[PDB]
Design a protein around this nucleic acid. Structure first.
Ligand SMILES: Nc1nc2c(ncn2[C@@H]2O[C@H](COP(=O)(O)OP(=O)(O)OP(=O)(O)O)[C@@H](O)[C@H]2O)c(=O)[nH]1
Ligand SMILES: [Mg+2]
Lengths: 75, 80, 82, 67, 69, 101
RNA sequence: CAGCUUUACAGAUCAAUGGCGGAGGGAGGUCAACAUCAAGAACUGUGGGCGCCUAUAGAACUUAUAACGAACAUGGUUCUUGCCUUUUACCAGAACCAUCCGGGUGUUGUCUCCAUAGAAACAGGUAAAGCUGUAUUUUUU
C-alpha cells in the first residue's frame, strides 16, 4: 500500500516527468517535475510548462502553485 | 401561510418545510432531523424542480437532504 | 454525531437512491457509509443527467458530491428517533 | 453512646418508633424505612440471633426441596 | 479520522469519475483520509493514457466505480 | 395450560422498537448477528441475556416486582420448569433483539 | 462567561395571547366500608372486521428454589398405617377439602393534627433552575 504522501515523496526525490491537471479546469494542463511538498497538497514545481489540451508548448517557468486546486500528478 | 414567531430551526421541527436547493430544486416536507452541518431528514419529502415554464413535481417520501447543497429553509405548513 | 448521517448508516442494506451535484441519479443496495458520506452501493442503476440509464454492479461515491439520498419507508418507524 | 449511638435512644420502646415520621409509616405502624447506620447497629446487636450464613450454597442437600 | 474502506477495492481497476465529466481507469495503489486516490495510470477519456503512476486529489473526485468485481 | 412453560398467547410483551421494523431489518444479511452467548456454569450469561431482553421490551408479564427491583435475577431465558427449579440453563432459549449499537 | 427556556421580585401600559380557572388542601389514623387478590404466566378496557378475530390504550397487588405470610396452626371426609383394640381422644402419612390467626393493594368514605390561597405571566432588569456555544479537500469561507 502507498498513501499519496509516500508516492509524492517518491516524486520529490526522483524529480521525474510530471503532468498536472487543474481543479475546476479542463482547458489547460501543466507539464513539469515535482520539487516541493507541503503538509497540505501545495507543491512547488520547477521546469513546469503550460500545456493546452488536445481538444504546442506554451511558455511557463518555475511555479509555486497553490495545491488546493490540483487534480492530477504523474512523475 | 401561518407559523409561530420561532427562535431557532429545531424548535419548529416536524413542520411542513419548503427547503430550497443550490441546483434549482425545492424539497417540501415535514422535517424529522437536522444537523450541525444542516443535513436534513424530511419525513414526506417532495421533489419540486423549476424547469426552464411551470413547476416540475415528484414525490420522494423519507429522504436525507445534504446540507452543503441547501440554499435556505422556509416553513410551508403546520404538523399533522 | 450527525443524526442524518446516523440515519444513513442505519439505512445500509436497503435499496436507496442517490443524486449528486452532477444530477445523475443512482439506485441500489447500500453497503458502506461514514461521517463524511463515503457511500458504496451494489446492483446500482446509474441514470446520467440526460436520462441515459447504465446498469452496473457496484459504485463508490464521495460525500462532498452527494445532494440527497432516497431512504425507504422502514426508517420512518425505528429506532433512531425514539 | 458510641458504637450503638443511634438505636440506643429508642431500641427499648413499646412500639420501637411511635413517631420518627421519616423512619416509619406513622402510628399505624405498618411500614418502615431506616437509614444505613442504624441498620448496621441493629445487625451488630443481632449477632446472637442473626441468620449468620451468607454462602447460599451451604444449604446443599439441606433445602426444603431436598427435605 | 474515519478511514474510507477502500481495502475491498485495493489492487483493482476502477472507473474514477472526476471534475468536468473526466474519467480515469487504473489499478489502485493506495489512499488517504481525504480520499486522494494513488493509482496506476491508465487510459483517460476515443481513449488515451497520460502518465504511468498517478495520484488524484479527493476534492476533484465525483465518484469511483467498480470496473473489476 | 401447562407446567413446562412459555407464553402461549396473542399478547406477547410489547417491545420498545416495533417487531415489523426488526423483521424488515432481517431482510438483508450483514445485519443479522447470531451471538450464541457461551461460558462456564454460572457465568451469568443467561442473566446477561435477561438484561438485554428487559432493556429491549417495555413491560414483560414474568418481570415480577422483585425481579424488576433486582433482588432475584429475571432469568428470562430459562423457560423450562426444570431450568427454573434446577437453577441451570439447560436448552437454547435465545432471542431475536433489534439491538442498537 | 454568552444565547434560549423556566421560577421569586418591584412597579408597570396592561394590548397580545396563552395557560394553573367555568381554579378549592396536606399529613396522617392498630378507623371503617366496598372491590379485589393461585390464573392458558395468568389482567382489563377501547375502538374496528366478521361469540369471536384485528389494531389501540392501559394495568396497583402477589409471586418462579413458585406463591398474598420469607409465618404457621386447626377441623372434616375418605385411603393407608401405628398405639391398640370399644369409642372419643389420638400416631403420621396420602389425596382431597374446609376453618382460623393474619397480609396486600386500589377506591370510597369518615376521625384526627396541621392547614387555609380566586389568579400569576407579557417589555425588559435582578437573582436562581433545565439545554447549546466558545477558513487553507466532504458541508460554513
Ligand atoms: N455476585 C454476583 N452474582 C451474580 C452476578 N450475575 C449472576 N450472578 C449469580 O450467579 C448466577 C449466574 O447467573 P445465571 O444466569 O443464573 O446462570 P447462567 O448464566 O444461566 O449459568 P448457566 O445456567 O450455566 O448458563 C445467578 O443465578 C446469580 O445468583 C453478578 O454480577 N454478581
Ligand atoms: Mg358398647
Amino acid at each position: 500500500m502507498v498513501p499519496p504522501i509516500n508516492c509524492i515523496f517518491n516524486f520529490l526525490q526522483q524529480q521525474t516527468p510530471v503532468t498536472i491537471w487543474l481543479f475546476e479546469q479542463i482547458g489547460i494542463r501543466i507539464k513539469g517535475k515535482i520539487v516541493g511538498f507541503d503538509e497540505f497538497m501545495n507543491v512547488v514545481i520547477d521546469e513546469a510548462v503550460e500545456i493546452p489540451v488536445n481538444s504546442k508548448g506554451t511558455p511557463l517557468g518555475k511555479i509555486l502553485l497553490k495545491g488546493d486546486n490540483i487534480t492530477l500528478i504523474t512523475s | 401561510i401561518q407559523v409561530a414567531h420561532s427562535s431557532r430551526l429545531a424548535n419548529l421541527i416536524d413542520y411542513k418545510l419548503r427547503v430550497l436547493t443550490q441546483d434549482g430544486r425545492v424539497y417540501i416536507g415535514q422535517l424529522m432531523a437536522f444537523d450541525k452541518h444542516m443535513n436534513l431528514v424530511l419525513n414526506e419529502c417532495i421533489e419540486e424542480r423549476v424547469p426552464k415554464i411551470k413547476v416540475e413535481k415528484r414525490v420522494l417520501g423519507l429522504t436525507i437532504l445534504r446540507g452543503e447543497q441547501i440554499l435556505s429553509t422556509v416553513v410551508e405548513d403546520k404538523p399533522l | 454525531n450527525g443524526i442524518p448521517v446516523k440515519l444513513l448508516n442505519e439505512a445500509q442494506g436497503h435499496i436507496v437512491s442517490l443524486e449528486l451535484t452532477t444530477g445523475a441519479t443512482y439506485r441500489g443496495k447500500l453497503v458502506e457509509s461514514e461521517d463524511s458520506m463515503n457511500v458504496q452501493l451494489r446492483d446500482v442503476i446509474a441514470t446520467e443527467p440526460q436520462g441515459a440509464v447504465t446498469h452496473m454492479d457496484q459504485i463508490f461515491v464521495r460525500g462532498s458530491q452527494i445532494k440527497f439520498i432516497v431512504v425507504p419507508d422502514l426508517l420512518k418507524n425505528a429506532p433512531l428517533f425514539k | 453512646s458510641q458504637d450503638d449511638e443511634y438505636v440506643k435512644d429508642w431500641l427499648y420502646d413499646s412500639r420501637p418508633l411511635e413517631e420518627d415520621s421519616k423512619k416509619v409509616n406513622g402510628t399505624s405502624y405498618k411500614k418502615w424505612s431506616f437509614d444505613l447506620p442504624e441498620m448496621s447497629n441493629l445487625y451488630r446487636l443481632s449477632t446472637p440471633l442473626r441468620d449468620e450464613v451468607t454462602d447460599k450454597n451451604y444449604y446443599y442437600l439441606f433445602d426444603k426441596k431436598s427435605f | 479520522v474515519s478511514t474510507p474502506e477502500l481495502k475491498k477495492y485495493m489492487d483493482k481497476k476502477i472507473l474514477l469519475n472526476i471534475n468536468g465529466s473526466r474519467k480515469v481507469a487504473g489499478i489502485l495503489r493506495g489512499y488517504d483520509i481525504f480520499l486522494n486516490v494513488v493509482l496506476d495510470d491508465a487510459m483517460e477519456i476515443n481513449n488515451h493514457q497520460l502518465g504511468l503512476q498517478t495520484v488524484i486529489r479527493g476534492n476533484s473526485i465525483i465518484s469511483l466505480e467498480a470496473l473489476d468485481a | 395450560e401447562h407446567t413446562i412453560f412459555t407464553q402461549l398467547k396473542k399478547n406477547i410483551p410489547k417491545t420498545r422498537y416495533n417487531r415489523d421494523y426488526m423483521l424488515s431489518m432481517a431482510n438483508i444479511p450483514e445485519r443479522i448477528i447470531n451471538v450464541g452467548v457461551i461460558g462456564p456454569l454460572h457465568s451469568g450469561k443467561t442473566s446477561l441475556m435477561d438484561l438485554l431482553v428487559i432493556d429491549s421490551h417495555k413491560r414483560i408479564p414474568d418481570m415480577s416486582k422483585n425481579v424488576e427491583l433486582g433482588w432475584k435475577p429475571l432469568r428470562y431465558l430459562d423457560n423450562l420448569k426444570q431450568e427454573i427449579d434446577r437453577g441451570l440453563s439447560i436448552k437454547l432459549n435465545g432471542s431475536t433483539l433489534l439491538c442498537t449499537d
